[model samples]
Target: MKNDLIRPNVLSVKIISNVSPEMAKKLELEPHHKSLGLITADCDDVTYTALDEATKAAEVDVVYARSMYAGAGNASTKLAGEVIGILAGPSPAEVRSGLNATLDFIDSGVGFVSANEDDSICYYAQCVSRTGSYLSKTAGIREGEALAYLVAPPLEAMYALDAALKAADVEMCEFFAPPTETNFAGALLTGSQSACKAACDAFAEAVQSVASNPLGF
Candidate 1:
């Protein structure tokens, strides 16, 4: 399981259809959206707070948390730093330490149970960092220097997870099991209620988690 830990590298291109001229100049994603459904996004920004706020202020739906980083050296560095910071937490914490494991998982070994959205989701993973999307001192551990792109594998990557786990004689939580055609309803509900929620649920489990934190707090 120690080997399961991984790095933190991400490129998020959230589609913003109703941005103003000011926001359009600041946050653009037309080309990237052409391939993926993204229209506008914030790359490697320090915090998603501003991004989320802008989206809300404009009442736009973020179609996809697209990964499209080409000339975003500053954004890339910021993203790398965010991931490393997450990893810097407890050594064995998935919610924290697995920054390394997440890197390992998305390097292709990762498993995604749902098709990118779920109504019951309390937390989620946003855009997965492409293997070697951004490199830092940790390059010695993994070899590869790459940029974020719109090409992402399907949600079925975790299709065999259940059987694989059973084969390995291991037990996983029910949530860890990949979804079936019947589960599609709840999955679709996420975006129907809120595109931003749907988008985040599709990638980062953070959507449900953040939205659900005791509102009274």
Candidate 2:
């Protein structure tokens, strides 16, 4: 089988090690947050997952994170990817540490896998070994639980989500229906680390199956 996984690319990273009081006020950062870390990445789902890594690396909070209306191809600026993630911390060192972890995670090539070799049909089927504060809160699960973040196009997403559930003993913690912010869909699954990994693999395989035989004729 050919590997067509597409990893996220960090387009830009800006670290305000020492955020000025005025700037903090303008950004509406928490009172305890004195430093800020910013990043833009081509893949929103992967980048947001990477942002969760920052919370585990250092004492930081994902203050703001949102994907563009369309996608990275329709970004406003050259350096702007599909999404922007902001991390706030109490100290510059902590913020820098968090950002470094996030960068490293993205650089590790953990991202969406393309179902088609010649097309841009891709999906994110990632498993987090241990849930961080950000993702745990988002998925409504306790921190340190294993999580499987599955995402794909609307049809593929629904199909793969079912496969994932059947493949493992994971619980569907959250579901992102069709036409999400970036016109995609997915869900958050939680279980044992191994079970989560199995769910992710099943989801990816189901997505590939759909791409290979859409009509089932």
Candidate 3:
């Protein structure tokens, strides 16, 4: 049998898990905190550059990165020209800093393709998973009127969902990992339109912060 999966170094694998407060204690980092960041749209180069600058600006987690062709067989329409990046971590300050760094860069792009208007970027909720907060109130529901889905790496589910749940008055729907578990992670939530947008806006920031991952079912 031949297997070809490019795994990041041990350090990289730890980076993937440490972003979630639930998993932070499991690695060099100590969780006790969790949140998310994301960035999408544009091509790989811009996406990578944005994320690189983001992490450099603060200590955050890299949930995952996906290029247009990263999807499985069956795909089209605004998928190829896009790349998404996802980030997570225990410190809201750091997460926000990282997100802001990338956002400002996106807003300050140069000519045509990289210009602010053409860059096409946005942000989401400022924080996630605050104790006794909106998220703490509903991190266990499975279904609701408006369901929200956010794409993330398996190690990042807690933080991703935490942020998603907090962004709006939504219930934390569920955490789903398919096809070999840690290979792909997704979070779901339920709420109203405004609530959903709040969450989506946060998830938008999260996706904006990362730039290559996509939401899963």
Q: Give the number of the best model, judged by lDDT.
A: 2
Estimate every model's Cα lDDT from 0 to 1.
0.25, 0.88, 0.45
Per-model TM-score on C-alpha atoms: 0.19, 0.92, 0.33
Candidate 1 lDDT for residue 54: 25
Across 1-217, the per-residue lDDT of candidate 1 in tens digits comes to 2112222234332222333456444445333222111222222221222222222223222332222323233344543322111111111222222222332333442222222233222122333222221221112222222111111122322322222322222222123222221121011111111332233333333222233342433
| lDDT (Cα, tens digit) per residue for candidate 2, span 75-184 | 87888778999999988888889999999988887877778867567888888999788999889999889899999999999999999999999999999988887889
Off by over 4 Å in 2: 17-28
Q: Which parts of model 1 have CA positions greater than 4 angstroms off?
A: 1-3, 10-64, 69-158, 161-217
The predicted structure with the larger lDDT, 2 or 3, is: 2
The TM-score that candidate 2 achieves is 0.92
Put down candidate 3 lDDT per residue, 37-86, tens digits, no spaces. Answer: 65555433334445555655677655566655443222365433345666
